[PDB]
Design a protein around this ligand. Structure first.
Ligand SMILES: Cc1cc2nc3c(=O)[nH]c(=O)nc-3n(C[C@H](O)[C@H](O)[C@H](O)COP(=O)(O)OP(=O)(O)OC[C@H]3O[C@@H](n4cnc5c(N)ncnc54)[C@H](O)[C@@H]3O)c2cc1C
Ligand SMILES: O=[NH+]c1cc(C(F)(F)F)cc2c(=O)nc(N3CCN(S(=O)(=O)C4CCCCC4)CC3)sc12
Length: 425
């Protein structure tokens, strides 16, 4: 145990906590039993690799259990497609161990430096959400250490389904996920076949994503112009694809198919042509880094699908705001799952990255308001400054969730800055 100052990736909202770090699960079981006996008393919260920007993995004046020591891969099985892994396993470790079995991590986020625990607790998503859903959809079982000190073996359709789906996306506030079983996606290669497309306006970007062409791709995302004024506003470089088969690989690659490996023109018409040519293509074979991985306030929201005029209004609001975001990711989500606090819903999702400067705070509070008004929501993994009232209206099943949480932790053994800020205890 060590008094430490914790922050999310965005290095904001620091608090000091007693960070327990042990590879012995039993010591984690005791640590919880010591907290549950001494009242709530600021409680405890699990931490993974600290990739949430927010305050969901910190607990000012309480216990923070570092789960990364507990990183044993117990088994992988290519016939069942199941991996059995401790919660502190990360998706890069997992991805590399699973490939020799013909198995693919079913949901990968923009970084592979996240733990399995954090992937479940934030119910993370990726470029294949419209074809695969989020991470919780592929969990077949997890062992949850609850406030009573018992370890419950939960399944998605068992008798404890309710607690299972409260843990999916429950930012650790139902207990510590010790271990889980995931169903992987079968693959014969570590490569993608990608199609690329460049649009010139927001209206075209929208139109490309509503042709029906998204149904031909399992992975899809886009880089998104949020600075340029209309008509350029919302032009995008779209990148869509599928996991390749061995047959579609070049000869050089079919022997190890599963192995993991002019500036004055830029803003002128010649730059426009180059960007469009380089960004337009078909059938390009790419490994994971090339396909998936090509001071600040990180902000992410989704607008339900039908509300397209509303989504266009929000992009216009951002462009006229005087806050310039260069690194913006756009994607059309597909169906949601049954976790009450799961962030993804079918509709228009986008991430923006704002330089911290005067007026930004108040401008993002207004963004919150328009996002809420238009039926959307923010992502806890990206947030540390929204209000409980805003969050509770964005998430109309919160009360349903809070009820489950109070049954399993009546003494508030599990707690985080986020839970206090967002009124989730
Ligand atoms: C560069 C970057 C790109 C990202 N891209 C994406 C993306 O494409 N899609 C997406 O959905 N997210 C994305 N994220 C967010 C990230 O995937 C999530 O925040 C994820 O939860 C981080 O995992 P972690 O192990 O770092 O968890 P932490 O940040 O350490 O913790 C996050 C939450 O998980 C809980 N938790 C962790 N381990 C356990 C456990 N064993 N038991 C119970 N609760 C636990 C914590 O209590 C906390 O509530 C990105 C983040 C960054 C920095
Ligand atoms: O956040 N919302 C997202 C939503 C999706 C979705 F919807 F498709 F699923 C996908 C992604 C993704 O795939 N990757 C992301 N990253 C964030 C930061 N960086 S960086 O910009 O590359 C780098 C920063 C510092 C130096 C300069 C460049 C690394 C990657 S975010 C993201």
């Amino acid at each position: 145990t060590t008094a430490t100052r914790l922050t999310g990736w965005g290095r904001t909202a620091p608090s000091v906590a007693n960070v327990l770090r042990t590879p012995d699960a039993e010591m984690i079981v005791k640590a919880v039993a010591r907290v549950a006996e001494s009242g709530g008393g600021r409680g405890a919260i699990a931490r993974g690799l600290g990739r949430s920007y927010g305050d969901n993995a910190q607990n000012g004046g309480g216990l923070v259990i570092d789960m990364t020591p507990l990183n044993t891969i117990h088994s992988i099985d290519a016939d069942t497609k199941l991996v059995d892994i401790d919660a502190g396993v990360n998706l890069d470790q997992l991805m590399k161990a699973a490939l020799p079995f013909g198995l693919w991590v079913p949901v990968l986020p923009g970084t592979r430096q996240v733990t399995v625990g954090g992937a479940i607790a934030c119910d993370i998503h990726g470029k294949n959400h419209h074809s695969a859903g989020s991470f919780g959809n592929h969990v077949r079982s997890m062992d949850l250490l609850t406030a009573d000190g018992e370890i419950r073996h939960l399944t998605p359709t068992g008798e404890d389904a309710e607690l299972f789906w409260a843990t999916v996306g429950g930012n650790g506030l139902t207990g510590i996920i010790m271990r889980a079983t995931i169903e992987m996606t079968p693959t014969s290669t570590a490569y993608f076949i990608a199609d690329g497309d460049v649009t010139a306006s927001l209206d075209e970007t929208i139109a490309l994503h509503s042709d029906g062409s998204e149904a031909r791709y399992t992975y899809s995302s886009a880089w998104f112009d949020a600075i340029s004024a209309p008509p350029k506003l919302g032009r995008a470089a779209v990148s869509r694809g599928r996991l390749a088969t061995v047959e579609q690989l070049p000869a050089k690659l079919r022997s190890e198919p599963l192995k993991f490996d002019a500036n004055k023109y830029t803003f002128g018409p010649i730059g426009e042509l180059w960007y469009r040519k380089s960004g337009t293509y078909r059938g390009k074979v790419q490994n994971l880094t090339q396909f998936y991985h090509p001071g600040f306030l990180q902000y992410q929201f989704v607008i339900p699908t039908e509300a397209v005029d509303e989504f266009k209004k929000i992009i216009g609001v951002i462009q006229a705001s005087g806050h310039y975001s260069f690194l913006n990711v756009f994607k059309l989500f597909g169906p949601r799952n049954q976790a009450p606090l799961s962030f993804p819903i079918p509709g228009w999702n986008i991430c923006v990255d704002f330089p911290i400067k005067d007026g930004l705070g108040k401008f993002v509070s207004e963004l919150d308001r328009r996002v809420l008004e238009f039926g959307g929501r923010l992502y806890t993994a990206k947030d540390s400054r929204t209000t409980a009232e805003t969050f509770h209206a964005m998430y109309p099943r919160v009360d349903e969730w809070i009820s489950v949480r109070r049954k399993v932790d009546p003494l508030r053994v599990f707690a985080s800055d986020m839970a206090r800020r967002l009124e989730l205890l």
